[PDB]
A paper describes a structure:
The “quasi-envelope” surrounds a capsid following a pseudo T  =  3 icosahedral symmetry with a diameter of approximately 30–33 nm, which consists of the capsid protein (pORF2) and identifies the pORF2 protruding (P) domain as the dimeric spike on the surface of the capsid.
Indeed, a crystal structure of the p60.12 Fab fragment in complex with a rat HEV P domain confirmed its binding mode to a quaternary epitope at the tip of the P domain dimer. Both bnAbs bind predominantly to one protomer but also make contacts with the other one, resulting in an asymmetric binding mode and indicating that a correctly folded pORF2 dimer is required for antigen-antibody interaction. The equilibrium dissociation constant of p60.1 and p60.12 to the rat HEV P domain was in the micromolar range, exhibiting an approximately 1000-fold lower affinity than the other four P domains. These results substantiate that the epitope targeted by the glycan-sensitive bnAbs is highly conserved among members of Hepeviridae, implying that viruses carrying specific escape mutations are not expected to readily emerge.
Author numbering:
A (entry chain L): 3 to 215
B (entry chain H): 2 to 25, 30 to 137, 143 to 224
C (entry chain A), D (entry chain B): 454 to 607
The structure:
């Protein structure tokens, strides 16, 4: 795999550069780095090839580059239809024949975000006998696309098969995330409780529930 | 040159499946899988005009790519399938109106390789309790096959909140999507909250009540 | 018959123009390639030193004594079999005979200078290889004719 | 002085090896063959027909009478100037003088056959252009020496 970050965001009237650092013998010596664009739920589209080149269809916005051992994609004059994953790929002339990047999530921050408010979902009398106790942290209306729900119930970390879902398109064009963490069924009275907190650079919500009031 | 690919191939964990990749001189049809969430990782790279397939060092023991020289087609056979192999796969030649190089273009539609123990599974109605001044209430669906499921409120004036959660890639392949709608929570008896969770491939229609925890 | 006598083919000077003819050439990724490396090769091959006008078949040469400025040929690699090396300034300009259907080397977009490789058994059997990227000229038999200009020995 | 007489430079036959020298050449973007196209060019330039051994400066060549098998060159107009064309089988093998620092043409990965272009004002002034992709050899002055082999007229 190629050393490529995902956190790329900025204003529409700004330029950006995505780093793609490989081996010292397969970037600086051999130059064949190709870039792609994966729109949500679509097949990849060729953007850049052989370090610096565009096909007849790719807008002049894209500009390839090679700075010694780090290749970078330069998107000057950003557009509103560019919220997609960006990859780099050099055919490394070593034991590994073709090497792909990590995948850069491009979230061009432009739309205003809403004030977050999180609360746990307790199962009703209809779901106590059915044994389907599920606490879902429904967080809607948020940007940028980087969400991983953490459950640190008064400093108590436990994770070895937690079901997590990534956001998609909604009726009001705002993202929504969830984290169905597994609960112990025969240990509710003995155990303490469950919490809900996510890192989003500004969001500060704690959710420590109580089984016995 | 244009690339056409085969449809969805749902199979059991431990079987073989061939994926046809049709084309419209010197085309080099490679293959790059797509693990949900994670980035693309290349695997195959046969040259139909020569017939020799030189696969990536990690695969090769399960992928057997052949070259149909009669109708310019390339097959991919992923044997020894599992839940980890449940991914969208694409066939990719290298083209540029005249150029040929170290890249991929065009790409196939994407063969849906759903590998899990299932055939025609459907869920019932398990709602999310609005245990009470704002209520972002809704209805959660747990397991079913194949995706998707139609979940909406009131079947008319409350359908302005339909959301679909993508493929939950875990130890199993039983899909899980959620669909909520923020509507006034001061009506639990008069405008009785009965959300609809329906599965079409398994038939039957069910509707259950939504009340806070008790 | 005593005709005009010129400088022989086995004697190469840094700068000489080399014309190689590769009739019935084939594509390869197993002869001069461990994993996946390309080149076109031909059983019968003719090498002409356009500068002198002297020419001879590869199979009819004593590659043991093929010199470059009073120094026998180098041998950087040896993947598959033994390989005599004739280096060149720039790249190899080769083509499919008669047609303008041109060929391109493996390092098609680098300042790397390509070289000619020759396999020799020691007596009356020689193949000539020329770097390529893909089957741009065909699978084979493909009649090729390449051209280049020798460089200095490393 | 009357020395031995050979076939002239202006007379070309499809197959002749061409050696170009572009002393202190510069990079050029929207200035040759077509719009937004790269190439290296030289004011002072020497063109040698390695086959005959005949050589002369571009500026000292009556490009009006430069023939190919009894047929004058296909002069083609560019967006700006009007240029003389010397076609070749295969591609152009050019390099930065002395060093193995090789060059590559604009069609670096296509079966397209490259050609040599010469601009001439009509009297004692002639530049020579050779296809390139980027500043692989530098910005300029960069001393280049290219090589290729004449092709048939279209």
């Amino acid at each position: 795999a190629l050393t490529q970050p995902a956190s790329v965001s900025g204003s529409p009237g700004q330029s950006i550069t995505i780093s793609c650092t490989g081996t010292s013998s397969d970037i600086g010596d051999y130059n064949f780095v190709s870039w792609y664009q994966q729109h949500p739920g679509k097949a990849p589209k060729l953007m850049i090839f052989d370090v610096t080149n565009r096909p007849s269809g790719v807008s002049n916005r894209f500009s390839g580059s090679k700075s010694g051992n780090t290749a970078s994609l330069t998107i000057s004059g950003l557009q509103v239809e560019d919220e997609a994953d960006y990859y780099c790929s050099s055919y490394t002339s070593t034991n590994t024949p073709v090497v792909f990047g990590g995948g850069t999530k491009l979230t061009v921050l432009g739309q205003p975000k809403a004030a977050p408010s999180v609360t746990l979902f307790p199962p009703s009398s209809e779901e106590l006998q059915a044994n389907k106790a599920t606490l879902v942290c429904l967080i809607s209306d948020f940007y940028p696309g980087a969400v991983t729900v953490a459950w640190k119930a008064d400093s108590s970390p436990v994770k070895a098969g937690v079901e997590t879902t990534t956001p998609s398109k909604q009726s009001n064009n705002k993202y929504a995330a969830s984290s169905y963490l597994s609960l112990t069924p025969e240990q509710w009275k003995s155990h303490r409780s469950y919490s809900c907190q996510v890192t989003h650079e500004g969001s500060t919500v704690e959710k420590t529930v109580a089984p016995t009031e | 040159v244009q690339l056409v690919q085969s449809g969805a191939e749902v199979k059991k964990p431990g079987s073989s499946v061939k994926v046809s990749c049709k084309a419209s001189s010197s085309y080099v049809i490679s293959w790059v899988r797509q693990a949900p969430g994670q980035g693309l990782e290349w695997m195959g790279g046969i040259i139909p005009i020569i017939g020799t397939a030189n696969y990536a060092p990690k695969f090769q023991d399960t992928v057997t790519i052949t070259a149909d020289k009669s109708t310019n087609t390339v097959y991919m056979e992923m044997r020894s399938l599992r839940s980890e192999d449940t991914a969208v796969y694409y066939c990719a030649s290298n083209v540029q109106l005249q150029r040929r190089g170290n890249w991929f273009d065009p790409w196939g539609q994407g063969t849906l390789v759903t590998v899990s123990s299932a055939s025609t599974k459907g869920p019932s109605v398990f709602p999310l309790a609005p245990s009470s001044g704002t209520a972002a209430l809704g209805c959660l669906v747990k397991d079913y096959f194949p995706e998707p499921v139609t979940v909406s409120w009131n079947s008319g004036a409350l359908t302005s909140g339909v959301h679909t959660f993508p493929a939950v890639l875990q130890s199993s392949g039983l899909y899980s999507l959620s669909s909520v709608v923020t509507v006034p929570s001061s009506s639990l008896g008069t405008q009785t909250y009965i959300c609809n969770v329906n599965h079409k491939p398994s038939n039957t229609k069910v509707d259950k009540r939504v009340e806070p925890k008790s | 018959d005593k005709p005009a006598p010129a400088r022989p083919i086995t004697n190469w000077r840094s700068g000489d123009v080399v014309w190689v003819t590769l009739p019935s050439a084939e594509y390869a990724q197993s002869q001069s390639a461990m994993g996946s490396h390309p080149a076109y090769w031909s059983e019968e091959a003719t090498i002409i030193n356009v500068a002198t006008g002297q020419r001879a078949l590869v199979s009819s040469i004593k590659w043991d004594q093929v010199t470059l400025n009073g120094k026998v040929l180098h041998k950087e690699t040896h993947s598959g079999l033994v390989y005599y090396q004739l280096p060149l300034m720039g790249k190899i300009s080769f083509w499919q005979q008669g047609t303008t259907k041109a060929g391109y080397t493996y390092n098609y977009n680098t300042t790397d200078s390509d070289s000619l490789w020759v396999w020799w058994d020691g007596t009356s059997k020689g193949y000539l290889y020329v770097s390529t990227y893909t089957t741009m000229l065909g699978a084979g038999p493909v009649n090729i004719t390449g051209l280049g200009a020798i460089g200095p020995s490393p």
